[PDB]
Structure formats: structure tokens, C-alpha cells
Amino acid sequence: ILEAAVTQSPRNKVAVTGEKVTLSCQQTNNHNNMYWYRQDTGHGLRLIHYSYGVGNTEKGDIPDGYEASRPSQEQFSLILELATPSQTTVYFCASGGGGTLYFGAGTRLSVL
């Protein structure tokens, strides 16, 4: 984008149960760390998977039923191999070095 260091795509996603879904997190700031959170109904952000650099993924608190991929410095992808309605939610990605968090604008996912 023209304005933000962190871009999420798509901004919306409708899946049918059983479809594979991939969400993209792209940052252009050379950030070492990337993160994927699911937002809960109290607007809490729950960590799914994160990454310390290219090629690395680490599991967060709620990894089950997601995988992650850090194929480049810029890109941290969240994959739902087989989407389920319990995965209907808003998802936010983030990136930074150290304790810094630059957040994406969010992706709304509905699994039907």
C-alpha cells in the first residue's frame, strides 16, 4: 500500500467448510518478527503462530487447525488447510523488531 508498513490480504474472506484458506501478511519494513492473531469476541488478540525470520515459524497459544509460512522477509502466511465454522472470526497480523508491533488492518473470515 501507499500508507502502511503492514498489509493484510484479502481484507475479507468467505469460505465453505472444508476449503483451504490462505491469508497474506506483507510488511515492507525489513521486520524480523511476524505474528498472526485471532480476535475474540471481547476484542482480545490471541496468538496463533509467529516467526523470528525467513524460514522460521513458531506456534502460539492457539495453533490447532492453522499452519504458517515465512517464505520471504516480507511475507507471513496463515493457512487453514480445511476451514471450519469455529474459525469464523477477525484475524490481525503484526510485525516488528524487539517488542514493536506494526498491525495490519484486519481480515474478516466467515466459514459457511
PDB file of N, CA and C in Angstrom:
ATOM      1  N   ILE A   1       0.835  -1.246   0.000  1.00  0.00           N
ATOM      2  CA  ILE A   1       0.000   0.000   0.000  1.00  0.00           C
ATOM      3  C   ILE A   1       0.853   1.274   0.000  1.00  0.00           C
ATOM      4  N   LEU A   2       0.189   2.422  -0.142  1.00  0.00           N
ATOM      5  CA  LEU A   2       0.878   3.708  -0.138  1.00  0.00           C
ATOM      6  C   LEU A   2       1.108   4.270   1.265  1.00  0.00           C
ATOM      7  N   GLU A   3       0.429   3.695   2.259  1.00  0.00           N
ATOM      8  CA  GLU A   3       0.360   4.297   3.597  1.00  0.00           C
ATOM      9  C   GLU A   3       0.879   3.446   4.760  1.00  0.00           C
ATOM     10  N   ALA A   4       0.763   2.128   4.666  1.00  0.00           N
ATOM     11  CA  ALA A   4       1.094   1.303   5.828  1.00  0.00           C
ATOM     12  C   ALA A   4       2.200   0.321   5.545  1.00  0.00           C
ATOM     13  N   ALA A   5       3.002   0.093   6.586  1.00  0.00           N
ATOM     14  CA  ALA A   5       4.112  -0.832   6.524  1.00  0.00           C
ATOM     15  C   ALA A   5       3.609  -2.256   6.486  1.00  0.00           C
ATOM     16  N   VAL A   6       2.401  -2.489   6.990  1.00  0.00           N
ATOM     17  CA  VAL A   6       1.874  -3.850   7.044  1.00  0.00           C
ATOM     18  C   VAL A   6       0.554  -3.924   6.308  1.00  0.00           C
ATOM     19  N   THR A   7       0.490  -4.804   5.315  1.00  0.00           N
ATOM     20  CA  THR A   7      -0.722  -5.015   4.513  1.00  0.00           C
ATOM     21  C   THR A   7      -1.218  -6.453   4.628  1.00  0.00           C
ATOM     22  N   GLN A   8      -2.499  -6.606   4.979  1.00  0.00           N
ATOM     23  CA  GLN A   8      -3.159  -7.902   5.013  1.00  0.00           C
ATOM     24  C   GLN A   8      -4.074  -8.106   3.811  1.00  0.00           C
ATOM     25  N   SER A   9      -4.077  -9.312   3.247  1.00  0.00           N
ATOM     26  CA  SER A   9      -4.990  -9.630   2.146  1.00  0.00           C
ATOM     27  C   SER A   9      -5.415 -11.098   2.124  1.00  0.00           C
ATOM     28  N   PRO A  10      -6.703 -11.356   1.805  1.00  0.00           N
ATOM     29  CA  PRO A  10      -7.665 -10.303   1.483  1.00  0.00           C
ATOM     30  C   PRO A  10      -8.119  -9.600   2.761  1.00  0.00           C
ATOM     31  N   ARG A  11      -8.885  -8.524   2.634  1.00  0.00           N
ATOM     32  CA  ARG A  11      -9.486  -7.877   3.799  1.00  0.00           C
ATOM     33  C   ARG A  11     -10.745  -8.637   4.268  1.00  0.00           C
ATOM     34  N   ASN A  12     -11.352  -9.371   3.332  1.00  0.00           N
ATOM     35  CA  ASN A  12     -12.495 -10.240   3.600  1.00  0.00           C
ATOM     36  C   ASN A  12     -12.329 -11.587   2.950  1.00  0.00           C
ATOM     37  N   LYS A  13     -12.912 -12.609   3.580  1.00  0.00           N
ATOM     38  CA  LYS A  13     -12.859 -13.949   3.033  1.00  0.00           C
ATOM     39  C   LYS A  13     -14.107 -14.752   3.453  1.00  0.00           C
ATOM     40  N   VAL A  14     -14.781 -15.316   2.454  1.00  0.00           N
ATOM     41  CA  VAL A  14     -15.876 -16.264   2.685  1.00  0.00           C
ATOM     42  C   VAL A  14     -15.439 -17.654   2.190  1.00  0.00           C
ATOM     43  N   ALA A  15     -15.461 -18.620   3.111  1.00  0.00           N
ATOM     44  CA  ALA A  15     -15.090 -19.984   2.818  1.00  0.00           C
ATOM     45  C   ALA A  15     -16.267 -20.923   3.075  1.00  0.00           C
ATOM     46  N   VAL A  16     -16.292 -22.037   2.359  1.00  0.00           N
ATOM     47  CA  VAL A  16     -17.226 -23.115   2.671  1.00  0.00           C
ATOM     48  C   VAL A  16     -16.416 -24.109   3.498  1.00  0.00           C
ATOM     49  N   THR A  17     -17.004 -24.641   4.570  1.00  0.00           N
ATOM     50  CA  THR A  17     -16.353 -25.677   5.391  1.00  0.00           C
ATOM     51  C   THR A  17     -15.580 -26.645   4.495  1.00  0.00           C
ATOM     52  N   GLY A  18     -14.328 -26.899   4.842  1.00  0.00           N
ATOM     53  CA  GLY A  18     -13.530 -27.811   4.057  1.00  0.00           C
ATOM     54  C   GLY A  18     -12.623 -27.182   3.020  1.00  0.00           C
ATOM     55  N   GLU A  19     -12.884 -25.936   2.648  1.00  0.00           N
ATOM     56  CA  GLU A  19     -11.984 -25.246   1.730  1.00  0.00           C
ATOM     57  C   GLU A  19     -10.665 -24.848   2.401  1.00  0.00           C
ATOM     58  N   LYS A  20      -9.593 -24.864   1.631  1.00  0.00           N
ATOM     59  CA  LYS A  20      -8.316 -24.299   2.071  1.00  0.00           C
ATOM     60  C   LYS A  20      -8.348 -22.769   1.991  1.00  0.00           C
ATOM     61  N   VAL A  21      -7.898 -22.089   3.049  1.00  0.00           N
ATOM     62  CA  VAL A  21      -7.836 -20.640   3.055  1.00  0.00           C
ATOM     63  C   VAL A  21      -6.406 -20.205   3.412  1.00  0.00           C
ATOM     64  N   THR A  22      -5.872 -19.270   2.637  1.00  0.00           N
ATOM     65  CA  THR A  22      -4.580 -18.684   2.944  1.00  0.00           C
ATOM     66  C   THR A  22      -4.746 -17.175   3.116  1.00  0.00           C
ATOM     67  N   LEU A  23      -4.279 -16.624   4.247  1.00  0.00           N
ATOM     68  CA  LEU A  23      -4.258 -15.183   4.460  1.00  0.00           C
ATOM     69  C   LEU A  23      -2.817 -14.666   4.363  1.00  0.00           C
ATOM     70  N   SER A  24      -2.662 -13.545   3.675  1.00  0.00           N
ATOM     71  CA  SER A  24      -1.355 -12.944   3.443  1.00  0.00           C
ATOM     72  C   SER A  24      -1.072 -11.788   4.401  1.00  0.00           C
ATOM     73  N   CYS A  25       0.116 -11.787   5.023  1.00  0.00           N
ATOM     74  CA  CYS A  25       0.651 -10.616   5.734  1.00  0.00           C
ATOM     75  C   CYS A  25       1.955 -10.140   5.063  1.00  0.00           C
ATOM     76  N   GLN A  26       1.943  -8.915   4.557  1.00  0.00           N
ATOM     77  CA  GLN A  26       3.107  -8.374   3.866  1.00  0.00           C
ATOM     78  C   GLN A  26       3.598  -7.111   4.580  1.00  0.00           C
ATOM     79  N   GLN A  27       4.870  -7.088   4.976  1.00  0.00           N
ATOM     80  CA  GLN A  27       5.470  -5.877   5.517  1.00  0.00           C
ATOM     81  C   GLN A  27       6.708  -5.519   4.722  1.00  0.00           C
ATOM     82  N   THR A  28       6.887  -4.222   4.514  1.00  0.00           N
ATOM     83  CA  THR A  28       7.976  -3.732   3.673  1.00  0.00           C
ATOM     84  C   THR A  28       9.088  -3.061   4.481  1.00  0.00           C
ATOM     85  N   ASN A  29       9.074  -3.260   5.805  1.00  0.00           N
ATOM     86  CA  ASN A  29       9.985  -2.546   6.737  1.00  0.00           C
ATOM     87  C   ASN A  29      11.217  -3.347   7.229  1.00  0.00           C
ATOM     88  N   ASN A  30      11.475  -4.460   6.553  1.00  0.00           N
ATOM     89  CA  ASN A  30      12.522  -5.409   6.905  1.00  0.00           C
ATOM     90  C   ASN A  30      12.346  -6.013   8.292  1.00  0.00           C
ATOM     91  N   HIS A  31      11.119  -6.039   8.803  1.00  0.00           N
ATOM     92  CA  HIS A  31      10.891  -6.560  10.143  1.00  0.00           C
ATOM     93  C   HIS A  31      11.325  -8.002  10.280  1.00  0.00           C
ATOM     94  N   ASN A  32      11.986  -8.331  11.389  1.00  0.00           N
ATOM     95  CA  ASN A  32      12.401  -9.704  11.632  1.00  0.00           C
ATOM     96  C   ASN A  32      11.239 -10.582  12.069  1.00  0.00           C
ATOM     97  N   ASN A  33      10.460 -10.081  13.016  1.00  0.00           N
ATOM     98  CA  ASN A  33       9.331 -10.830  13.608  1.00  0.00           C
ATOM     99  C   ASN A  33       7.998 -10.612  12.924  1.00  0.00           C
ATOM    100  N   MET A  34       7.233 -11.690  12.709  1.00  0.00           N
ATOM    101  CA  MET A  34       5.861 -11.537  12.206  1.00  0.00           C
ATOM    102  C   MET A  34       4.935 -12.384  13.077  1.00  0.00           C
ATOM    103  N   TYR A  35       3.660 -11.999  13.138  1.00  0.00           N
ATOM    104  CA  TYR A  35       2.677 -12.610  14.056  1.00  0.00           C
ATOM    105  C   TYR A  35       1.331 -12.757  13.385  1.00  0.00           C
ATOM    106  N   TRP A  36       0.555 -13.779  13.774  1.00  0.00           N
ATOM    107  CA  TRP A  36      -0.837 -13.874  13.370  1.00  0.00           C
ATOM    108  C   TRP A  36      -1.669 -14.065  14.631  1.00  0.00           C
ATOM    109  N   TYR A  37      -2.674 -13.206  14.772  1.00  0.00           N
ATOM    110  CA  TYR A  37      -3.620 -13.241  15.896  1.00  0.00           C
ATOM    111  C   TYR A  37      -5.029 -13.471  15.363  1.00  0.00           C
ATOM    112  N   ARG A  38      -5.829 -14.166  16.160  1.00  0.00           N
ATOM    113  CA  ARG A  38      -7.281 -14.203  16.008  1.00  0.00           C
ATOM    114  C   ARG A  38      -7.904 -13.313  17.059  1.00  0.00           C
ATOM    115  N   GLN A  39      -8.864 -12.490  16.642  1.00  0.00           N
ATOM    116  CA  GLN A  39      -9.529 -11.587  17.572  1.00  0.00           C
ATOM    117  C   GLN A  39     -10.706 -12.339  18.187  1.00  0.00           C
ATOM    118  N   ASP A  40     -10.888 -12.244  19.498  1.00  0.00           N
ATOM    119  CA  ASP A  40     -12.002 -12.898  20.174  1.00  0.00           C
ATOM    120  C   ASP A  40     -13.193 -11.932  20.354  1.00  0.00           C
ATOM    121  N   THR A  41     -14.311 -12.422  20.885  1.00  0.00           N
ATOM    122  CA  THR A  41     -15.492 -11.586  20.986  1.00  0.00           C
ATOM    123  C   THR A  41     -15.340 -10.447  21.997  1.00  0.00           C
ATOM    124  N   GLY A  42     -14.324 -10.528  22.850  1.00  0.00           N
ATOM    125  CA  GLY A  42     -14.046  -9.407  23.740  1.00  0.00           C
ATOM    126  C   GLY A  42     -12.974  -8.497  23.153  1.00  0.00           C
ATOM    127  N   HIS A  43     -12.652  -8.725  21.876  1.00  0.00           N
ATOM    128  CA  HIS A  43     -11.633  -7.961  21.133  1.00  0.00           C
ATOM    129  C   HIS A  43     -10.225  -8.251  21.628  1.00  0.00           C
ATOM    130  N   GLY A  44     -10.054  -9.377  22.302  1.00  0.00           N
ATOM    131  CA  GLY A  44      -8.718  -9.832  22.640  1.00  0.00           C
ATOM    132  C   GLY A  44      -8.047 -10.426  21.426  1.00  0.00           C
ATOM    133  N   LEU A  45      -6.727 -10.261  21.341  1.00  0.00           N
ATOM    134  CA  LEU A  45      -5.957 -10.804  20.235  1.00  0.00           C
ATOM    135  C   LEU A  45      -5.199 -12.007  20.756  1.00  0.00           C
ATOM    136  N   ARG A  46      -5.523 -13.173  20.199  1.00  0.00           N
ATOM    137  CA  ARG A  46      -4.938 -14.450  20.611  1.00  0.00           C
ATOM    138  C   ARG A  46      -3.922 -14.977  19.569  1.00  0.00           C
ATOM    139  N   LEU A  47      -2.703 -15.245  20.020  1.00  0.00           N
ATOM    140  CA  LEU A  47      -1.575 -15.548  19.116  1.00  0.00           C
ATOM    141  C   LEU A  47      -1.672 -16.956  18.583  1.00  0.00           C
ATOM    142  N   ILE A  48      -1.689 -17.060  17.259  1.00  0.00           N
ATOM    143  CA  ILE A  48      -1.814 -18.351  16.584  1.00  0.00           C
ATOM    144  C   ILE A  48      -0.448 -18.909  16.254  1.00  0.00           C
ATOM    145  N   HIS A  49       0.340 -18.161  15.479  1.00  0.00           N
ATOM    146  CA  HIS A  49       1.684 -18.595  15.123  1.00  0.00           C
ATOM    147  C   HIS A  49       2.484 -17.318  14.934  1.00  0.00           C
ATOM    148  N   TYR A  50       3.813 -17.412  15.073  1.00  0.00           N
ATOM    149  CA  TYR A  50       4.703 -16.284  14.826  1.00  0.00           C
ATOM    150  C   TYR A  50       6.008 -16.761  14.189  1.00  0.00           C
ATOM    151  N   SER A  51       6.873 -15.799  13.910  1.00  0.00           N
ATOM    152  CA  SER A  51       8.101 -16.063  13.161  1.00  0.00           C
ATOM    153  C   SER A  51       9.160 -15.066  13.557  1.00  0.00           C
ATOM    154  N   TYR A  52      10.378 -15.576  13.726  1.00  0.00           N
ATOM    155  CA  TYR A  52      11.593 -14.811  14.048  1.00  0.00           C
ATOM    156  C   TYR A  52      12.428 -14.450  12.797  1.00  0.00           C
ATOM    157  N   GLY A  53      12.040 -14.958  11.637  1.00  0.00           N
ATOM    158  CA  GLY A  53      12.769 -14.650  10.408  1.00  0.00           C
ATOM    159  C   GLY A  53      12.374 -15.626   9.316  1.00  0.00           C
ATOM    160  N   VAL A  54      12.881 -15.365   8.108  1.00  0.00           N
ATOM    161  CA  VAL A  54      12.663 -16.217   6.916  1.00  0.00           C
ATOM    162  C   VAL A  54      12.913 -17.675   7.240  1.00  0.00           C
ATOM    163  N   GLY A  55      11.975 -18.526   6.831  1.00  0.00           N
ATOM    164  CA  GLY A  55      12.071 -19.954   7.061  1.00  0.00           C
ATOM    165  C   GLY A  55      11.607 -20.426   8.421  1.00  0.00           C
ATOM    166  N   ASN A  56      11.346 -19.506   9.351  1.00  0.00           N
ATOM    167  CA  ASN A  56      11.002 -19.923  10.712  1.00  0.00           C
ATOM    168  C   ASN A  56       9.518 -19.710  11.027  1.00  0.00           C
ATOM    169  N   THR A  57       8.895 -20.700  11.668  1.00  0.00           N
ATOM    170  CA  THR A  57       7.570 -20.499  12.256  1.00  0.00           C
ATOM    171  C   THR A  57       7.569 -21.126  13.632  1.00  0.00           C
ATOM    172  N   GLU A  58       6.858 -20.485  14.547  1.00  0.00           N
ATOM    173  CA  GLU A  58       6.760 -20.948  15.933  1.00  0.00           C
ATOM    174  C   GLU A  58       5.293 -20.970  16.280  1.00  0.00           C
ATOM    175  N   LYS A  59       4.870 -21.937  17.098  1.00  0.00           N
ATOM    176  CA  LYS A  59       3.451 -21.996  17.492  1.00  0.00           C
ATOM    177  C   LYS A  59       3.119 -21.076  18.669  1.00  0.00           C
ATOM    178  N   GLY A  60       1.950 -20.444  18.602  1.00  0.00           N
ATOM    179  CA  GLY A  60       1.477 -19.565  19.652  1.00  0.00           C
ATOM    180  C   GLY A  60       0.580 -20.339  20.614  1.00  0.00           C
ATOM    181  N   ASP A  61      -0.415 -19.657  21.159  1.00  0.00           N
ATOM    182  CA  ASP A  61      -1.326 -20.243  22.175  1.00  0.00           C
ATOM    183  C   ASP A  61      -2.469 -21.055  21.543  1.00  0.00           C
ATOM    184  N   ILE A  62      -2.886 -20.636  20.355  1.00  0.00           N
ATOM    185  CA  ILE A  62      -3.988 -21.303  19.652  1.00  0.00           C
ATOM    186  C   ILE A  62      -3.618 -21.766  18.222  1.00  0.00           C
ATOM    187  N   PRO A  63      -2.566 -22.607  18.094  1.00  0.00           N
ATOM    188  CA  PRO A  63      -2.149 -23.102  16.764  1.00  0.00           C
ATOM    189  C   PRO A  63      -3.082 -24.101  16.042  1.00  0.00           C
ATOM    190  N   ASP A  64      -3.856 -24.892  16.798  1.00  0.00           N
ATOM    191  CA  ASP A  64      -4.627 -26.006  16.216  1.00  0.00           C
ATOM    192  C   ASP A  64      -5.486 -25.548  15.049  1.00  0.00           C
ATOM    193  N   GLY A  65      -5.407 -26.272  13.934  1.00  0.00           N
ATOM    194  CA  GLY A  65      -6.276 -26.039  12.769  1.00  0.00           C
ATOM    195  C   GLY A  65      -5.843 -24.884  11.874  1.00  0.00           C
ATOM    196  N   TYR A  66      -4.364 -24.331  12.193  1.00  0.00           N
ATOM    197  CA  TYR A  66      -3.669 -23.402  11.318  1.00  0.00           C
ATOM    198  C   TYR A  66      -2.268 -23.870  11.143  1.00  0.00           C
ATOM    199  N   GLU A  67      -1.704 -23.530  10.002  1.00  0.00           N
ATOM    200  CA  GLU A  67      -0.257 -23.599   9.834  1.00  0.00           C
ATOM    201  C   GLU A  67       0.186 -22.232   9.370  1.00  0.00           C
ATOM    202  N   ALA A  68       1.496 -22.018   9.389  1.00  0.00           N
ATOM    203  CA  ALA A  68       2.075 -20.741   8.979  1.00  0.00           C
ATOM    204  C   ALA A  68       3.265 -20.957   8.058  1.00  0.00           C
ATOM    205  N   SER A  69       3.589 -19.920   7.298  1.00  0.00           N
ATOM    206  CA  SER A  69       4.711 -19.995   6.386  1.00  0.00           C
ATOM    207  C   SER A  69       5.373 -18.639   6.256  1.00  0.00           C
ATOM    208  N   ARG A  70       6.699 -18.626   6.426  1.00  0.00           N
ATOM    209  CA  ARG A  70       7.508 -17.417   6.267  1.00  0.00           C
ATOM    210  C   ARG A  70       8.476 -17.614   5.092  1.00  0.00           C
ATOM    211  N   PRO A  71       7.964 -17.501   3.856  1.00  0.00           N
ATOM    212  CA  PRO A  71       8.785 -17.831   2.697  1.00  0.00           C
ATOM    213  C   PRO A  71       9.760 -16.727   2.321  1.00  0.00           C
ATOM    214  N   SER A  72       9.534 -15.520   2.821  1.00  0.00           N
ATOM    215  CA  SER A  72      10.396 -14.359   2.487  1.00  0.00           C
ATOM    216  C   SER A  72      10.426 -13.426   3.680  1.00  0.00           C
ATOM    217  N   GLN A  73      11.285 -12.409   3.654  1.00  0.00           N
ATOM    218  CA  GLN A  73      11.301 -11.442   4.759  1.00  0.00           C
ATOM    219  C   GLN A  73       9.941 -10.766   4.895  1.00  0.00           C
ATOM    220  N   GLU A  74       9.299 -10.486   3.765  1.00  0.00           N
ATOM    221  CA  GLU A  74       8.091  -9.661   3.750  1.00  0.00           C
ATOM    222  C   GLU A  74       6.854 -10.379   4.166  1.00  0.00           C
ATOM    223  N   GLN A  75       6.801 -11.667   3.872  1.00  0.00           N
ATOM    224  CA  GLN A  75       5.554 -12.432   3.847  1.00  0.00           C
ATOM    225  C   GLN A  75       5.443 -13.441   4.981  1.00  0.00           C
ATOM    226  N   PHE A  76       4.333 -13.351   5.723  1.00  0.00           N
ATOM    227  CA  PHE A  76       3.990 -14.356   6.734  1.00  0.00           C
ATOM    228  C   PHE A  76       2.539 -14.809   6.484  1.00  0.00           C
ATOM    229  N   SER A  77       2.387 -16.039   6.018  1.00  0.00           N
ATOM    230  CA  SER A  77       1.099 -16.558   5.559  1.00  0.00           C
ATOM    231  C   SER A  77       0.473 -17.468   6.612  1.00  0.00           C
ATOM    232  N   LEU A  78      -0.819 -17.294   6.774  1.00  0.00           N
ATOM    233  CA  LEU A  78      -1.613 -18.135   7.662  1.00  0.00           C
ATOM    234  C   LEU A  78      -2.467 -19.034   6.773  1.00  0.00           C
ATOM    235  N   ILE A  79      -2.325 -20.345   6.946  1.00  0.00           N
ATOM    236  CA  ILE A  79      -3.043 -21.330   6.152  1.00  0.00           C
ATOM    237  C   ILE A  79      -4.036 -22.132   7.007  1.00  0.00           C
ATOM    238  N   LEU A  80      -5.273 -22.218   6.524  1.00  0.00           N
ATOM    239  CA  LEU A  80      -6.283 -23.109   7.096  1.00  0.00           C
ATOM    240  C   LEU A  80      -6.469 -24.191   6.051  1.00  0.00           C
ATOM    241  N   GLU A  81      -5.867 -25.352   6.290  1.00  0.00           N
ATOM    242  CA  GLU A  81      -5.902 -26.434   5.311  1.00  0.00           C
ATOM    243  C   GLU A  81      -7.332 -26.903   5.019  1.00  0.00           C
ATOM    244  N   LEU A  82      -8.192 -26.839   6.025  1.00  0.00           N
ATOM    245  CA  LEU A  82      -9.559 -27.305   5.864  1.00  0.00           C
ATOM    246  C   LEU A  82     -10.444 -26.474   6.807  1.00  0.00           C
ATOM    247  N   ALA A  83     -11.004 -25.388   6.283  1.00  0.00           N
ATOM    248  CA  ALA A  83     -11.696 -24.409   7.142  1.00  0.00           C
ATOM    249  C   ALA A  83     -12.922 -24.983   7.870  1.00  0.00           C
ATOM    250  N   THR A  84     -13.129 -24.538   9.100  1.00  0.00           N
ATOM    251  CA  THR A  84     -14.286 -24.963   9.901  1.00  0.00           C
ATOM    252  C   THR A  84     -14.996 -23.735  10.448  1.00  0.00           C
ATOM    253  N   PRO A  85     -16.308 -23.857  10.725  1.00  0.00           N
ATOM    254  CA  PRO A  85     -17.018 -22.695  11.241  1.00  0.00           C
ATOM    255  C   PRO A  85     -16.461 -22.117  12.539  1.00  0.00           C
ATOM    256  N   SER A  86     -15.804 -22.923  13.394  1.00  0.00           N
ATOM    257  CA  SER A  86     -15.148 -22.368  14.593  1.00  0.00           C
ATOM    258  C   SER A  86     -14.034 -21.384  14.240  1.00  0.00           C
ATOM    259  N   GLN A  87     -13.629 -21.345  12.971  1.00  0.00           N
ATOM    260  CA  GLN A  87     -12.606 -20.402  12.543  1.00  0.00           C
ATOM    261  C   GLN A  87     -13.144 -19.072  12.023  1.00  0.00           C
ATOM    262  N   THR A  88     -14.459 -18.957  11.946  1.00  0.00           N
ATOM    263  CA  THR A  88     -15.107 -17.678  11.646  1.00  0.00           C
ATOM    264  C   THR A  88     -14.719 -16.638  12.680  1.00  0.00           C
ATOM    265  N   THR A  89     -14.099 -15.539  12.234  1.00  0.00           N
ATOM    266  CA  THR A  89     -13.559 -14.539  13.147  1.00  0.00           C
ATOM    267  C   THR A  89     -12.852 -13.397  12.395  1.00  0.00           C
ATOM    268  N   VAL A  90     -12.358 -12.407  13.128  1.00  0.00           N
ATOM    269  CA  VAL A  90     -11.487 -11.407  12.550  1.00  0.00           C
ATOM    270  C   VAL A  90     -10.069 -11.849  12.898  1.00  0.00           C
ATOM    271  N   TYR A  91      -9.137 -11.643  11.965  1.00  0.00           N
ATOM    272  CA  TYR A  91      -7.728 -12.012  12.134  1.00  0.00           C
ATOM    273  C   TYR A  91      -6.849 -10.797  11.902  1.00  0.00           C
ATOM    274  N   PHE A  92      -5.853 -10.587  12.767  1.00  0.00           N
ATOM    275  CA  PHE A  92      -4.926  -9.487  12.580  1.00  0.00           C
ATOM    276  C   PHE A  92      -3.516 -10.033  12.527  1.00  0.00           C
ATOM    277  N   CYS A  93      -2.758  -9.535  11.573  1.00  0.00           N
ATOM    278  CA  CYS A  93      -1.346  -9.863  11.568  1.00  0.00           C
ATOM    279  C   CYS A  93      -0.558  -8.658  12.089  1.00  0.00           C
ATOM    280  N   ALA A  94       0.678  -8.901  12.515  1.00  0.00           N
ATOM    281  CA  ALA A  94       1.514  -7.818  13.008  1.00  0.00           C
ATOM    282  C   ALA A  94       2.967  -8.106  12.670  1.00  0.00           C
ATOM    283  N   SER A  95       3.815  -7.093  12.741  1.00  0.00           N
ATOM    284  CA  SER A  95       5.255  -7.330  12.533  1.00  0.00           C
ATOM    285  C   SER A  95       6.056  -6.255  13.261  1.00  0.00           C
ATOM    286  N   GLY A  96       7.347  -6.527  13.467  1.00  0.00           N
ATOM    287  CA  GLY A  96       8.251  -5.596  14.121  1.00  0.00           C
ATOM    288  C   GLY A  96       9.602  -6.237  14.468  1.00  0.00           C
ATOM    289  N   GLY A  97      10.474  -5.441  15.079  1.00  0.00           N
ATOM    290  CA  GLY A  97      11.691  -5.979  15.732  1.00  0.00           C
ATOM    291  C   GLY A  97      11.480  -5.776  17.234  1.00  0.00           C
ATOM    292  N   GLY A  98      12.145  -6.558  18.074  1.00  0.00           N
ATOM    293  CA  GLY A  98      12.064  -6.338  19.528  1.00  0.00           C
ATOM    294  C   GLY A  98      10.625  -6.477  19.970  1.00  0.00           C
ATOM    295  N   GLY A  99      10.178  -5.584  20.868  1.00  0.00           N
ATOM    296  CA  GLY A  99       8.781  -5.521  21.329  1.00  0.00           C
ATOM    297  C   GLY A  99       7.823  -4.731  20.440  1.00  0.00           C
ATOM    298  N   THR A 100       8.304  -4.185  19.326  1.00  0.00           N
ATOM    299  CA  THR A 100       7.435  -3.383  18.445  1.00  0.00           C
ATOM    300  C   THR A 100       6.412  -4.200  17.670  1.00  0.00           C
ATOM    301  N   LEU A 101       5.190  -3.664  17.594  1.00  0.00           N
ATOM    302  CA  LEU A 101       4.111  -4.260  16.804  1.00  0.00           C
ATOM    303  C   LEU A 101       3.500  -3.240  15.838  1.00  0.00           C
ATOM    304  N   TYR A 102       3.766  -3.443  14.539  1.00  0.00           N
ATOM    305  CA  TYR A 102       3.045  -2.764  13.482  1.00  0.00           C
ATOM    306  C   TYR A 102       1.911  -3.643  13.009  1.00  0.00           C
ATOM    307  N   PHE A 103       0.469  -3.364  13.222  1.00  0.00           N
ATOM    308  CA  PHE A 103      -0.622  -4.272  12.918  1.00  0.00           C
ATOM    309  C   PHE A 103      -1.146  -4.005  11.523  1.00  0.00           C
ATOM    310  N   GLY A 104      -1.541  -5.079  10.844  1.00  0.00           N
ATOM    311  CA  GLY A 104      -2.399  -4.995   9.664  1.00  0.00           C
ATOM    312  C   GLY A 104      -3.803  -4.480   9.987  1.00  0.00           C
ATOM    313  N   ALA A 105      -4.603  -4.246   8.943  1.00  0.00           N
ATOM    314  CA  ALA A 105      -5.913  -3.624   9.126  1.00  0.00           C
ATOM    315  C   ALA A 105      -7.002  -4.664   9.423  1.00  0.00           C
ATOM    316  N   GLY A 106      -6.669  -5.944   9.307  1.00  0.00           N
ATOM    317  CA  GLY A 106      -7.639  -6.979   9.646  1.00  0.00           C
ATOM    318  C   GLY A 106      -8.240  -7.687   8.450  1.00  0.00           C
ATOM    319  N   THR A 107      -8.608  -8.939   8.677  1.00  0.00           N
ATOM    320  CA  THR A 107      -9.282  -9.753   7.686  1.00  0.00           C
ATOM    321  C   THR A 107     -10.502 -10.332   8.364  1.00  0.00           C
ATOM    322  N   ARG A 108     -11.678 -10.134   7.772  1.00  0.00           N
ATOM    323  CA  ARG A 108     -12.887 -10.801   8.295  1.00  0.00           C
ATOM    324  C   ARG A 108     -13.054 -12.104   7.576  1.00  0.00           C
ATOM    325  N   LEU A 109     -13.082 -13.217   8.328  1.00  0.00           N
ATOM    326  CA  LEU A 109     -13.314 -14.547   7.743  1.00  0.00           C
ATOM    327  C   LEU A 109     -14.640 -15.160   8.226  1.00  0.00           C
ATOM    328  N   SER A 110     -15.457 -15.586   7.260  1.00  0.00           N
ATOM    329  CA  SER A 110     -16.715 -16.290   7.511  1.00  0.00           C
ATOM    330  C   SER A 110     -16.619 -17.667   6.830  1.00  0.00           C
ATOM    331  N   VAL A 111     -16.719 -18.726   7.634  1.00  0.00           N
ATOM    332  CA  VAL A 111     -16.719 -20.103   7.133  1.00  0.00           C
ATOM    333  C   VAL A 111     -18.137 -20.673   7.230  1.00  0.00           C
ATOM    334  N   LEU A 112     -18.736 -20.966   6.073  1.00  0.00           N
ATOM    335  CA  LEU A 112     -20.146 -21.369   5.994  1.00  0.00           C
ATOM    336  C   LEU A 112     -20.292 -22.887   5.937  1.00  0.00           C
TER     337      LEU A 112
END
